[PDB]
Design a protein around this motif. Structure first.
Motif, short mmCIF file in Angstrom:
data_model
loop_
_atom_site.label_atom_id
_atom_site.label_comp_id
_atom_site.label_asym_id
_atom_site.label_seq_id
_atom_site.Cartn_x
_atom_site.Cartn_y
_atom_site.Cartn_z
N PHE A 17 0.02 0.76 8.45
CA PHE A 17 0.93 0.26 9.46
C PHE A 17 0.53 -1.21 9.90
O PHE A 17 1.35 -2.00 10.04
N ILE A 44 -1.94 7.65 7.79
CA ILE A 44 -0.87 6.85 7.67
C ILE A 44 -0.76 5.54 8.42
O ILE A 44 -0.68 4.36 8.05
N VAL A 82 12.55 5.06 3.59
CA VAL A 82 12.02 6.01 2.69
C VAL A 82 13.41 6.24 1.62
O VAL A 82 14.53 5.84 2.37
N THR A 114 4.28 7.95 -3.70
CA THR A 114 3.34 7.50 -4.13
C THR A 114 3.42 7.58 -5.53
O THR A 114 2.88 6.87 -6.63
N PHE A 142 0.32 0.03 -1.51
CA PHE A 142 0.15 -0.41 0.21
C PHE A 142 0.81 -1.86 0.32
O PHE A 142 1.42 -2.19 1.21
N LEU A 154 4.93 9.58 13.06
CA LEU A 154 3.55 9.67 12.32
C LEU A 154 2.50 9.88 13.06
O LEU A 154 1.67 10.53 12.76
N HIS A 160 -9.02 4.90 2.46
CA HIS A 160 -7.97 6.04 2.12
C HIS A 160 -8.48 6.96 1.09
O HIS A 160 -8.07 8.22 1.65
#
Ligand SMILES: O=C(O)Cc1cccc(-c2noc(-c3ccccc3)c2C(=O)NCCOc2ccc(Cl)cc2Cl)c1
Length: 253
Positions: free
Chosen positions: A146, A142, A119, A67, A105, A131, A227
């Motif tokens: 998704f 996280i 990644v 990020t 996002f 995750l 978040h």
């Protein structure tokens, strides 16, 4: 001309982001295979960072890396569009600060996929199952992303649309603290018109893609709010963690 406006932005997008959706999508499908990360073993193998005492916190620091780099590319992107840079440096910062994560996002969705996400610009693939197996605080922070990405990628937009989409997000005259709110709203309406136009052109059979896409923009505003709250709690309950000073600046609110 909106057609000229949508292209200028699209190029600003092509020049500032390392990972485009076109590329990401082909990797997640063909060309060459990425390295799958699903446990301490593989995660390190892939890294072959602040002090971490467990896998979960480790991944926490990973996302931050992802990020921070994105906040950087987003700033360069946001600057590539003329009108934006004309705004007062303060507001410029304000827009980024409050809209940065929504832009993140939305784009990360391009890297996401039902079973995991790419990644290090496609170098590796972190499986969703991995995750979900992290301590509750981190596992479920996280996850929402998704579910969002999956539904979002369904509208099947391409980089040309995304360019406009994230522009319409960063240039949100509704952020708290803007000085020249009107000028931001002005810029955004142009973007939104370029977005409107472009969609109806690029995706002519997707009748409600625009009002539907604007909603996804709303889901993000909501997604980030939740978040930030979870970031909050991770800062409050996981006293051992910490966040990159840049993220430290964005989460001052
Ligand atoms: O708040 C911040 O700015 C940074 C931060 C901190 C904690 C959790 C998340 C966060 N919650 O859901 C998401 C998310 C989930 C799926 C798709 C897109 C985004 C992310 C996120 O930033 N992901 C990008 C990195 O993904 C990585 C990179 C490396 C590794 Cl080894 C593992 C992971 Cl999952 C972000």
């Amino acid at each position: 001309d909106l057609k000229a406006f949508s292209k200028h932005i699209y190029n600003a997008y092509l020049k500032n982001f390392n990972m485009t959706k076109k590329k990401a999508r082909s990797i997640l499908t063909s060309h060459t295979a990425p390295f799958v990360i699903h446990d301490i073993e593989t995660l390190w193998q892939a890294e072959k960072l602040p002090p971490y005492k467990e896998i979960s916190v480790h991944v926490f620091y990973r996302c931050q890396c992802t990020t921070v780099e994105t906040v950087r590319e987003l700033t360069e992107f946001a600057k590539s569009i003329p009108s934006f840079s004309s705004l007062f440096l303060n507001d410029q910062v304000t827009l980024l600060k409050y809209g940065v994560h929504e832009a993140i996002f939305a784009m990360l969705a391009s890297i996401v996929n039902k079973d995991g996400l790419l990644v290090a610009n496609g170098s590796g693939f972190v499986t969703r199952e991995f995750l979900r197996s992290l301590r509750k605080p981190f596992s479920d922070i996280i996850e929402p992303k998704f579910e969002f990405a999956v539904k979002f990628n369904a509208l099947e937009l391409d980089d040309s649309d995304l360019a406009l989409f994230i522009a319409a997000i960063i240039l949100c005259g509704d952020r708290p603290g803007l000085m020249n709110v009107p000028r931001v709203e002005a810029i955004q309406d142009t973007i939104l018109r370029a977005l409107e136009f472009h969609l109806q052109a690029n995706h002519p059979d997707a009748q409600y893609l625009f009002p539907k896409l604007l909603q996804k923009m709303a889901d993000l505003r909501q997604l980030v709010t939740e978040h930030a709250q979870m970031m909050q709690r991770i800062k409050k309950t996981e006293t051992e963690t910490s966040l990159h000073p840049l993220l430290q600046e964005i989460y001052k609110d």
